[PDB]
Design a protein around this nucleic acid. Structure first.
Ligand SMILES: Nc1nc2[nH]c(N)nc2c(=O)[nH]1
Ligand SMILES: [Ca+2]
Length: 314
DNA sequence: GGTAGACCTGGACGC
DNA sequence: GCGTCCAGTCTACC
Protein backbone atom coordinates (compact mmCIF):
# COMPACT_ATOMS: atom_id res chain seq x y z
CA UNK A 1 0.00 0.00 0.00
CA UNK A 2 2.87 2.36 0.77
CA UNK A 3 4.73 1.40 -2.40
CA UNK A 4 3.78 1.84 -6.05
CA UNK A 5 1.53 4.31 -7.80
CA UNK A 6 -1.03 5.69 -5.35
CA UNK A 7 -4.77 5.52 -5.82
CA UNK A 8 -7.52 7.71 -4.39
CA UNK A 9 -9.03 4.69 -2.66
CA UNK A 10 -5.84 3.10 -1.29
CA UNK A 11 -4.24 6.19 0.26
CA UNK A 12 -7.07 8.66 1.13
CA UNK A 13 -5.02 10.77 3.54
CA UNK A 14 -2.64 11.27 0.64
CA UNK A 15 -4.87 13.29 -1.73
CA UNK A 16 -5.93 16.94 -1.90
CA UNK A 17 -8.78 18.18 -4.08
CA UNK A 18 -9.27 21.16 -6.35
CA UNK A 19 -12.76 22.31 -7.37
CA UNK A 20 -13.09 21.30 -11.00
CA UNK A 21 -16.18 19.93 -12.81
CA UNK A 22 -15.89 17.49 -15.70
CA UNK A 23 -17.24 20.38 -17.77
CA UNK A 24 -14.01 22.28 -17.10
CA UNK A 25 -11.58 19.40 -17.55
CA UNK A 26 -11.47 15.80 -18.71
CA UNK A 27 -8.09 14.28 -17.95
CA UNK A 28 -8.74 11.35 -20.24
CA UNK A 29 -9.31 13.72 -23.15
CA UNK A 30 -6.49 16.13 -22.42
CA UNK A 31 -3.47 14.16 -21.23
CA UNK A 32 -3.19 11.51 -23.99
CA UNK A 33 -4.23 13.87 -26.80
CA UNK A 34 -0.84 15.03 -28.01
CA UNK A 35 -0.30 18.25 -26.02
CA UNK A 36 2.05 16.77 -23.41
CA UNK A 37 3.53 13.33 -23.96
CA UNK A 38 4.50 12.55 -20.38
CA UNK A 39 1.27 11.40 -18.70
CA UNK A 40 0.42 7.72 -18.28
CA UNK A 41 -2.76 6.21 -16.89
CA UNK A 42 -0.94 3.89 -14.49
CA UNK A 43 -4.16 2.86 -12.75
CA UNK A 44 -7.59 3.17 -14.31
CA UNK A 45 -8.62 6.85 -14.40
CA UNK A 46 -5.38 7.74 -12.53
CA UNK A 47 -2.77 9.69 -14.49
CA UNK A 48 0.88 10.00 -13.44
CA UNK A 49 3.58 12.31 -14.75
CA UNK A 50 5.99 15.09 -13.96
CA UNK A 51 4.57 18.48 -13.10
CA UNK A 52 6.80 21.31 -11.97
CA UNK A 53 9.81 19.09 -11.27
CA UNK A 54 7.78 16.64 -9.16
CA UNK A 55 5.84 13.48 -9.85
CA UNK A 56 2.08 13.57 -9.47
CA UNK A 57 -0.87 11.25 -9.91
CA UNK A 58 -4.24 12.79 -10.78
CA UNK A 59 -7.77 11.47 -10.92
CA UNK A 60 -11.14 13.15 -10.91
CA UNK A 61 -14.65 12.77 -9.55
CA UNK A 62 -17.71 14.56 -10.92
CA UNK A 63 -16.84 17.89 -9.33
CA UNK A 64 -13.31 17.38 -8.02
CA UNK A 65 -9.76 17.03 -9.33
CA UNK A 66 -7.87 14.81 -6.91
CA UNK A 67 -4.15 15.48 -6.69
CA UNK A 68 -1.35 13.61 -4.95
CA UNK A 69 2.39 14.38 -5.06
CA UNK A 70 5.55 12.31 -4.49
CA UNK A 71 8.49 14.34 -3.19
CA UNK A 72 10.35 13.61 2.72
CA UNK A 73 7.62 12.15 4.91
CA UNK A 74 4.66 11.40 2.64
CA UNK A 75 2.22 14.25 3.26
CA UNK A 76 -0.48 16.07 1.35
CA UNK A 77 -0.03 18.53 -1.47
CA UNK A 78 0.35 21.97 0.06
CA UNK A 79 -1.76 24.92 -1.11
CA UNK A 80 1.22 26.24 -3.10
CA UNK A 81 1.75 22.85 -4.78
CA UNK A 82 -1.90 22.60 -5.72
CA UNK A 83 -1.44 26.05 -7.20
CA UNK A 84 1.21 24.61 -9.51
CA UNK A 85 -1.44 22.24 -10.86
CA UNK A 86 -4.04 24.98 -11.32
CA UNK A 87 -1.47 26.87 -13.36
CA UNK A 88 -0.58 23.79 -15.42
CA UNK A 89 -4.24 23.39 -16.39
CA UNK A 90 -4.84 27.17 -16.57
CA UNK A 91 -7.97 26.79 -14.49
CA UNK A 92 -8.62 30.55 -14.32
CA UNK A 93 -9.69 30.32 -17.96
CA UNK A 94 -13.36 29.24 -17.96
CA UNK A 95 -13.78 26.46 -20.52
CA UNK A 96 -17.58 26.77 -20.47
CA UNK A 97 -17.39 30.42 -21.54
CA UNK A 98 -15.16 29.52 -24.47
CA UNK A 99 -17.25 26.51 -25.54
CA UNK A 100 -20.37 28.67 -25.43
CA UNK A 101 -18.78 31.31 -27.62
CA UNK A 102 -17.32 28.88 -30.14
CA UNK A 103 -20.48 26.82 -30.32
CA UNK A 104 -22.38 30.07 -30.80
CA UNK A 105 -20.49 31.09 -33.96
CA UNK A 106 -19.80 27.57 -35.27
CA UNK A 107 -22.66 25.13 -35.71
CA UNK A 108 -20.37 22.20 -36.28
CA UNK A 109 -18.46 23.00 -33.10
CA UNK A 110 -21.62 22.94 -30.95
CA UNK A 111 -22.39 19.54 -32.41
CA UNK A 112 -18.99 18.01 -31.65
CA UNK A 113 -18.41 19.88 -28.37
CA UNK A 114 -21.59 18.40 -26.85
CA UNK A 115 -19.82 15.02 -26.66
CA UNK A 116 -16.31 16.29 -25.98
CA UNK A 117 -16.25 18.61 -23.02
CA UNK A 118 -13.32 19.36 -20.75
CA UNK A 119 -10.78 19.82 -23.50
CA UNK A 120 -8.52 22.69 -22.49
CA UNK A 121 -4.83 23.63 -23.03
CA UNK A 122 -1.95 22.69 -20.77
CA UNK A 123 0.45 25.53 -19.93
CA UNK A 124 3.77 23.80 -20.63
CA UNK A 125 7.44 24.49 -20.09
CA UNK A 126 8.98 26.09 -23.21
CA UNK A 127 11.94 23.71 -23.47
CA UNK A 128 10.00 20.48 -23.06
CA UNK A 129 7.33 21.69 -25.45
CA UNK A 130 9.92 22.76 -28.01
CA UNK A 131 11.87 19.55 -28.17
CA UNK A 132 8.82 17.37 -27.63
CA UNK A 133 7.19 18.80 -30.74
CA UNK A 134 10.42 18.76 -32.74
CA UNK A 135 10.01 14.99 -32.27
CA UNK A 136 6.36 15.22 -33.41
CA UNK A 137 6.84 16.07 -37.12
CA UNK A 138 5.67 13.48 -39.65
CA UNK A 139 5.01 11.11 -36.76
CA UNK A 140 2.25 9.55 -34.65
CA UNK A 141 1.41 10.32 -31.03
CA UNK A 142 2.11 6.76 -29.86
CA UNK A 143 5.63 6.78 -31.35
CA UNK A 144 6.35 10.33 -30.23
CA UNK A 145 5.48 9.33 -26.68
CA UNK A 146 8.16 6.63 -26.58
CA UNK A 147 10.77 8.89 -28.15
CA UNK A 148 10.08 11.60 -25.59
CA UNK A 149 10.23 9.02 -22.80
CA UNK A 150 13.56 7.51 -23.83
CA UNK A 151 14.90 11.02 -24.38
CA UNK A 152 14.08 12.08 -20.80
CA UNK A 153 15.37 8.81 -19.41
CA UNK A 154 18.75 9.26 -21.12
CA UNK A 155 19.35 12.97 -20.52
CA UNK A 156 16.86 14.08 -17.88
CA UNK A 157 17.32 14.30 -14.08
CA UNK A 158 16.20 11.14 -12.31
CA UNK A 159 13.37 12.02 -9.94
CA UNK A 160 11.68 9.16 -8.06
CA UNK A 161 10.58 5.56 -8.71
CA UNK A 162 7.05 4.17 -8.41
CA UNK A 163 6.78 0.41 -8.99
CA UNK A 164 9.13 -0.24 -11.92
CA UNK A 165 8.74 3.27 -13.31
CA UNK A 166 11.58 5.73 -12.79
CA UNK A 167 10.53 9.31 -13.54
CA UNK A 168 12.83 11.86 -15.12
CA UNK A 169 12.64 15.62 -15.41
CA UNK A 170 12.80 17.02 -18.92
CA UNK A 171 16.40 17.39 -20.24
CA UNK A 172 18.17 20.73 -19.94
CA UNK A 173 19.41 22.74 -22.93
CA UNK A 174 23.02 22.07 -21.92
CA UNK A 175 22.31 18.34 -21.77
CA UNK A 176 20.69 18.30 -25.20
CA UNK A 177 23.64 20.26 -26.58
CA UNK A 178 26.20 17.82 -25.20
CA UNK A 179 28.57 15.79 -27.41
CA UNK A 180 27.35 12.74 -29.32
CA UNK A 181 23.77 13.48 -28.28
CA UNK A 182 22.38 13.05 -31.78
CA UNK A 183 24.10 9.70 -32.17
CA UNK A 184 22.68 8.51 -28.86
CA UNK A 185 19.22 9.76 -29.83
CA UNK A 186 19.44 7.82 -33.08
CA UNK A 187 20.09 4.58 -31.18
CA UNK A 188 17.04 5.64 -29.18
CA UNK A 189 14.99 5.73 -32.38
CA UNK A 190 14.25 9.41 -33.07
CA UNK A 191 15.19 8.97 -36.71
CA UNK A 192 16.32 12.13 -38.48
CA UNK A 193 14.91 14.26 -35.66
CA UNK A 194 17.86 13.24 -33.51
CA UNK A 195 19.93 15.83 -35.38
CA UNK A 196 17.19 18.46 -35.00
CA UNK A 197 17.12 18.17 -31.24
CA UNK A 198 20.90 18.40 -31.06
CA UNK A 199 21.18 21.17 -33.61
CA UNK A 200 18.37 23.21 -32.05
CA UNK A 201 19.80 22.77 -28.57
CA UNK A 202 23.15 24.21 -29.72
CA UNK A 203 21.67 26.93 -31.92
CA UNK A 204 19.68 28.24 -28.97
CA UNK A 205 22.64 28.14 -26.64
CA UNK A 206 25.39 29.17 -29.09
CA UNK A 207 23.49 31.65 -31.33
CA UNK A 208 20.30 32.97 -29.75
CA UNK A 209 21.55 33.86 -26.28
CA UNK A 210 20.23 30.75 -24.58
CA UNK A 211 17.18 30.07 -22.44
CA UNK A 212 16.47 33.77 -21.94
CA UNK A 213 15.75 33.97 -25.66
CA UNK A 214 12.94 31.40 -25.44
CA UNK A 215 11.45 32.50 -22.13
CA UNK A 216 11.32 36.04 -23.49
CA UNK A 217 9.06 35.10 -26.40
CA UNK A 218 6.20 34.77 -23.92
CA UNK A 219 6.10 38.58 -23.80
CA UNK A 220 6.62 38.92 -27.55
CA UNK A 221 3.83 38.75 -30.15
CA UNK A 222 2.45 35.62 -31.78
CA UNK A 223 3.83 36.84 -35.10
CA UNK A 224 7.25 37.50 -33.56
CA UNK A 225 7.39 34.30 -31.53
CA UNK A 226 6.31 32.08 -34.44
CA UNK A 227 8.82 33.84 -36.68
CA UNK A 228 11.70 33.41 -34.23
CA UNK A 229 10.97 29.69 -33.69
CA UNK A 230 11.20 28.78 -37.37
CA UNK A 231 14.85 29.82 -37.07
CA UNK A 232 15.53 26.57 -35.18
CA UNK A 233 16.15 23.28 -37.05
CA UNK A 234 13.18 20.93 -37.19
CA UNK A 235 10.82 23.74 -36.25
CA UNK A 236 8.42 24.62 -39.06
CA UNK A 237 4.96 26.22 -39.20
CA UNK A 238 3.24 23.46 -37.19
CA UNK A 239 5.82 22.95 -34.45
CA UNK A 240 6.18 26.69 -34.08
CA UNK A 241 2.41 27.03 -33.74
CA UNK A 242 2.26 24.21 -31.18
CA UNK A 243 4.96 25.90 -29.11
CA UNK A 244 3.33 29.35 -29.27
CA UNK A 245 -0.05 27.86 -28.35
CA UNK A 246 1.00 25.35 -25.72
CA UNK A 247 3.96 27.03 -24.02
CA UNK A 248 4.12 30.73 -24.99
CA UNK A 249 0.55 31.83 -24.21
CA UNK A 250 -0.49 32.43 -27.84
CA UNK A 251 -4.12 31.17 -27.74
CA UNK A 252 -4.72 32.26 -31.36
CA UNK A 253 -1.98 30.02 -32.70
CA UNK A 254 -3.57 27.20 -34.70
CA UNK A 255 -1.28 24.28 -35.52
CA UNK A 256 -1.95 22.84 -38.99
CA UNK A 257 -1.42 19.12 -39.47
CA UNK A 258 -3.05 16.23 -41.27
CA UNK A 259 -5.92 16.17 -38.76
CA UNK A 260 -6.82 19.84 -39.18
CA UNK A 261 -6.85 19.44 -42.97
CA UNK A 262 -9.25 16.51 -42.77
CA UNK A 263 -11.50 18.39 -40.37
CA UNK A 264 -11.44 21.47 -42.60
CA UNK A 265 -12.37 19.56 -45.75
CA UNK A 266 -14.84 17.13 -44.15
CA UNK A 267 -16.62 19.41 -41.68
CA UNK A 268 -16.38 22.83 -43.32
CA UNK A 269 -15.95 21.94 -46.98
CA UNK A 270 -12.89 24.20 -46.93
CA UNK A 271 -10.63 24.89 -49.91
CA UNK A 272 -7.70 27.26 -50.25
CA UNK A 273 -8.82 30.50 -51.91
CA UNK A 274 -5.93 32.98 -51.89
CA UNK A 275 -3.70 30.03 -52.75
CA UNK A 276 -3.48 28.37 -56.16
CA UNK A 277 -2.26 25.07 -54.68
CA UNK A 278 -5.18 22.97 -53.43
CA UNK A 279 -3.29 20.68 -51.07
CA UNK A 280 -0.97 21.08 -48.04
CA UNK A 281 1.82 23.62 -48.65
CA UNK A 282 3.40 26.51 -46.77
CA UNK A 283 0.86 28.81 -48.42
CA UNK A 284 -2.29 26.70 -48.01
CA UNK A 285 -1.37 25.78 -44.43
CA UNK A 286 -0.95 29.42 -43.56
CA UNK A 287 -4.33 30.22 -45.04
CA UNK A 288 -6.05 27.38 -43.18
CA UNK A 289 -4.63 28.74 -39.95
CA UNK A 290 -6.10 32.14 -40.72
CA UNK A 291 -9.45 30.59 -41.63
CA UNK A 292 -9.77 28.90 -38.25
CA UNK A 293 -8.74 32.08 -36.48
CA UNK A 294 -11.29 34.07 -38.43
CA UNK A 295 -13.75 31.34 -37.54
CA UNK A 296 -13.12 30.99 -33.79
CA UNK A 297 -11.52 34.23 -32.67
CA UNK A 298 -8.76 35.01 -30.11
CA UNK A 299 -8.73 31.47 -28.65
CA UNK A 300 -8.80 29.65 -31.96
CA UNK A 301 -5.90 27.49 -30.78
CA UNK A 302 -7.98 26.19 -27.89
CA UNK A 303 -11.04 25.50 -30.09
CA UNK A 304 -8.73 23.67 -32.44
CA UNK A 305 -7.68 21.43 -29.55
CA UNK A 306 -11.26 20.33 -28.99
CA UNK A 307 -11.81 19.13 -32.55
CA UNK A 308 -8.29 17.74 -32.88
CA UNK A 309 -8.71 15.71 -29.73
CA UNK A 310 -12.15 14.48 -30.89
CA UNK A 311 -10.73 13.66 -34.31
CA UNK A 312 -8.23 11.33 -32.65
CA UNK A 313 -11.14 9.25 -31.33
CA UNK A 314 -11.71 7.60 -34.68
C1' DG B 1 8.58 32.96 -54.49
C1' DG B 2 6.32 28.13 -55.03
C1' DT B 3 6.28 22.86 -55.85
C1' DA B 4 8.91 17.81 -55.62
C1' DG B 5 10.13 13.78 -53.53
C1' DA B 6 13.36 12.14 -49.52
C1' DC B 7 12.91 11.11 -45.01
C1' DC B 8 13.49 7.43 -39.24
C1' DT B 9 10.10 4.46 -37.32
C1' DG B 10 6.57 1.17 -36.43
C1' DG B 11 1.14 -0.02 -36.35
C1' DA B 12 -1.97 -0.94 -39.61
C1' DC B 13 -3.79 -2.79 -43.53
C1' DG B 14 -4.20 -5.45 -48.07
C1' DC B 15 -2.92 -9.25 -50.63
C1' DG C 1 4.78 -13.25 -44.03
C1' DC C 2 6.85 -8.60 -47.52
C1' DG C 3 5.55 -4.24 -49.75
C1' DT C 4 2.56 0.21 -49.20
C1' DC C 5 0.40 3.76 -46.40
C1' DC C 6 0.53 7.11 -42.83
C1' DA C 7 1.23 9.79 -38.60
C1' DG C 8 6.15 17.95 -41.21
C1' DT C 9 10.52 19.93 -42.33
C1' DC C 10 14.16 20.65 -45.39
C1' DT C 11 16.45 20.90 -49.89
C1' DA C 12 16.82 20.91 -54.74
C1' DC C 13 15.35 23.08 -58.73
C1' DC C 14 11.84 25.83 -61.60
N1 LIG D 1 -3.06 20.51 -35.10
C1 LIG D 1 -2.46 19.86 -34.09
N2 LIG D 1 -1.47 19.01 -34.33
C2 LIG D 1 -1.01 18.45 -33.19
N3 LIG D 1 0.00 17.52 -33.11
C3 LIG D 1 0.14 17.23 -31.77
N4 LIG D 1 1.02 16.34 -31.29
N5 LIG D 1 -0.69 17.89 -31.00
C4 LIG D 1 -1.42 18.66 -31.89
C5 LIG D 1 -2.48 19.58 -31.65
O1 LIG D 1 -2.99 19.90 -30.58
N6 LIG D 1 -2.95 20.14 -32.83
CA1 LIG E 1 1.50 13.32 -43.64
Amino acid sequence: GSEGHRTLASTPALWASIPCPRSELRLDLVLPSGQSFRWREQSPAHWSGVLADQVWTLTQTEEQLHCTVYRSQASRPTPDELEAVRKYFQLDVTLAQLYHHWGSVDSHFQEVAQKFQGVRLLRQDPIECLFSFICSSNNNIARITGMVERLCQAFGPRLIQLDDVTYHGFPSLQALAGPEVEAHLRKLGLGYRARYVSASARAILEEQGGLAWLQQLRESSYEEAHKALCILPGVGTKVADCICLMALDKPQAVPVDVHMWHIAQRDYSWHPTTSQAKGPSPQTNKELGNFFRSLWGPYAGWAQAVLFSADLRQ
